[PDB]
Design a protein around this nucleic acid. Structure first.
Lengths: 93, 63, 38, 17
RNA sequence: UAAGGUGAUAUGAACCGUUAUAACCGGCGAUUUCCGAAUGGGGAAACCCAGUGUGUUUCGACACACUAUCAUUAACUGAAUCCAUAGGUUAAUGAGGCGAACCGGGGGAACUGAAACAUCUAAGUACCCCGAGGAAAAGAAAUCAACCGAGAUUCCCCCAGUAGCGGCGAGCGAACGGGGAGCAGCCCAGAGCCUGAAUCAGUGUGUGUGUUAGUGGAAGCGUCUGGAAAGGCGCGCGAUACAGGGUGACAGCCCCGUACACAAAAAUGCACAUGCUGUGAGCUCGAUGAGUAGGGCGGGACACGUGGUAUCCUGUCUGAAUA
RNA sequence: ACCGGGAGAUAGCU
RNA sequence: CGAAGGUGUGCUGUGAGGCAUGCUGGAGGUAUCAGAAGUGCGAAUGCUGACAUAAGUAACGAUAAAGCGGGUGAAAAGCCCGCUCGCCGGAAGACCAAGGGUUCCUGUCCAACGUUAAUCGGGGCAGGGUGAGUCGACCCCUAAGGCGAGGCCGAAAGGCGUAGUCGAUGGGAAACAGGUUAAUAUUCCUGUACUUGGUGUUACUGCGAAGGGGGGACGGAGAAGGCUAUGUUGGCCGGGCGACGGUUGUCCCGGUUUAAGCGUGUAGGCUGGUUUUCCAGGCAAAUCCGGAAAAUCAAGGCUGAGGCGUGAUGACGAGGCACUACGGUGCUGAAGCAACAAAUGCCCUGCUUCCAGGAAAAGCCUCUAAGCAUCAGGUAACAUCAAAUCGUACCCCAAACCGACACAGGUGGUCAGGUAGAGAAUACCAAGGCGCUUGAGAGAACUCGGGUGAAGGAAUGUCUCCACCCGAGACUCAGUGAAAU
């Protein structure tokens, strides 16, 4: 079954920011980058399997890429998706 | 390291693929994202190994 | 945007053989933006 | 980490930086 | 081939390997996201919504394959009336589109020339649609020729601005014949005799040839100018290799190259031999193409525009002979 | 009306 | 030990040209003889790049307009904060639609630009920010409309068109109060709950449609009232006590909030119901709809204002106070109530009439056809799970959208107050938004002179090392620095 490998692949990298730290310290949530699709059920299952923690609900959003001009040539950064996984009273990382 | 797993059975090579996908890949990407990874060739090596294992699995299973 | 897409979308072009010829000429001329779309 | 981006040599009327 | 590399802008950090699984090229394979004929349905292109059959960590929900049309074939169903038909369901074969030009078929103008303009020219050109092809079409006389003579078609040069057509104006313009590239003949309309009998189509093996990676491959030093010399001077050498590029100034003898000699594990097109499946030699006779020719009506191509107008076709009405 | 082709239409005229 | 090209000179020939040379140039040129030109430019309102003349002329970027004190900066009228002064205040205010794409905010410097400068900017560079069961899109159904399997027609082409299949600019399931970042908030939290479903337990039933009906269901106008948002009168609380007269007094200021849902469901109108029987039709079946008869009572349901409490000993809240790393956090919590008026907001798709009679389908609803009729199937209560995906920043009557310039013009709807005033008319004002661009030669980098300038005098400042001021050389106000020509 490729469910496990898909769950491993959906998670790409965490997101670090002042808002992320505030959310972690107050609301007990971790914000991390996810795959382009990264459906809620799949990301929740991947978090449960990998971080061996318990979560309440997961909501995600799409961040539109910025258009930057390198030299005289324009270019739009690739779109990336971020998900906020809310941990329960018991969290480890 | 290309013919070491060529003679391995389907189940054991699938288990090796699962191990490569889980360990040495998720941890490496997390370390790279956090900035704690000092060496980057490990990501390329593990990706190439996973691709080779997948190719061997496709060649063996089925045809 | 909806009206623009409906009146100049590639599907609307293909709906009539004339639009297919227009698309073929565009491809031959090698224009980067074949049609109007988001 | 990739701090260096290899900024290119700009135009004569370029941002003073 | 291999001791340099992780394609470039574009350096850097971190790495592989140096006698071979570093890196690069090539042949054979796998994967090949979504839209794109798009083909499960829809739609605003990279988006949304489903059914069926295969197996499964909390019923949770997942992964794979199928789900458009036409024509034909096979099978099962199948009313208006018994039978039947049409229609319906499943499986197999081929296509649905793109691609610069070339071929044929069906259409098809206007500007312009005649100093105008309606016949004509422009022109069966531009353009539109359909077909498969690598060439296409056509091709073995119901031909010319003249009563001397040739036996397929296509293309080139004369014939030839000739004869002819043409408000006999502008303009269009052959044919017979001669010389060249190339020459291949047959099949069905039907019976009997001997019956794989040559020629071909579809597939394996062997021989020669070419590509997809490539290998070897000769020969100059010192002095002067001079940023540096391939430049000047002196004396030597290779050449089946001074055809070309790079090298601080113009190089045969500095390097890549060139003449020349080789190289292929694997797939290849070409010319043959050897194996298998399919249609298929010659002998005797007959048959030898019917709604066709032709004719009346109005036109198109043959230079021939209806003029005395030969030939074919065209929509319509007629319409025999067949040796 | 616009776009491409006939078409570098023709023009006894500047 | 110097080709072509460029810049000057001297000769030479009737001429188009030729020769030699200094200078920058830097590696090609080429004697004589023969051959072809994309073979020689001064004009065709010729075409492309550059630059003078007018043109350093035209306005200064919307008549609300800014003045000052301080913080920064090298420099500040426009940069930051504060105090004053003027404006819109039914828009220049607050939202979303569309339209754009990160213009949102933190840090950073003015490379370039901003009708001057700008240290600021929607500038330029890095980093964050958009969290959707309850928002909208999305999806169910739909007409306007299309498309079109078969097929009909039609030289090809293509047009028509059934089955259907697409869609809204419409009808369908549901959220609010408060708190909360520099940027998000109904999707971030604190609670209340409301809806969507399937599956599992409970009880059994009568369930069961490309069928029946209602419903959806739709026009203008008129009295409107029972009310509410909203405001004002009182009202308690907190303060307070008055630099130019009085102002402990009916003196002055600030607040005195209502959620979504739960019921309660009232004024309202609507038409009568309760029952007995039979029966046409809606094709069909129906017991459902309805039609007619009869006895009875007048009740019948409809949603519905508001209302009350529950929600809710709700959060919020007069506030002052502890710090105030001086931006804010925290202490929390007093009153948090009555009357009037009143909406163009509800009841209200109401009611009433007026007239020509004012979409469509699906959802929603009972009987039910066949079929199933121990069951399957559904509701009722409980259980769990999940509610796919997409946008969520920012301008949005505007500097970011459509307008040839940060173009003066516009840009759909939506909330759109108080006073005087009947008047979303005006005039002025609360909150909110603002002040929407001016004035520069700086004497700057640097140059020179001086009135002069701390001291020693040889190092009167000419120097150890001095600076203010003045005279001059130094873009000038800076900008549309076009225009025909």
């Amino acid at each position: 079954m490729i469910r496990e490998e898909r769950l491993l692949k959906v998670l790409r990298a965490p997101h670090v920011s002042e808002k992320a730290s505030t959310a972690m310290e107050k609301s007990n949530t971790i914000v991390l980058k996810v795959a382009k699709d990264a459906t809620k059920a799949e990301i929740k299952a991947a978090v449960q399997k990998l971080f061996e923690v318990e979560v309440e609900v997961v909501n995600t959003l799409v961040v539109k890429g910025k258009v930057k001009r390198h030299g005289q040539r324009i270019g739009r950064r690739s779109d990336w998706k971020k998900a906020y996984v809310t941990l329960k009273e018991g969290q480890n990382l | 390291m290309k013919a070491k797993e060529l003679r391995e059975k389907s189940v054991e090579e699938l288990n090796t693929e699962l191990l490569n996908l889980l360990r040495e890949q998720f941890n490496l990407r997390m370390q790279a994202a956090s900035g704690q990874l000092q060496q980057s060739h490990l990501l390329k090596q593990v990706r190439r190994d996973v691709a080779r294992v997948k190719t061997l699995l496709n060649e063996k299973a089925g045809a | 945007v909806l009206k623009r897409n409906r009146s100049h979308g590639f599907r609307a072009r293909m709906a009539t053989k004339n639009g297919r010829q227009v698309l073929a000429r565009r491809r031959a001329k090698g224009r980067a933006r074949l049609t109007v779309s988001k | 980490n990739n701090r260096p981006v290899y900024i290119p040599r700009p135009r004569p009327p370029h941002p003073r930086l």
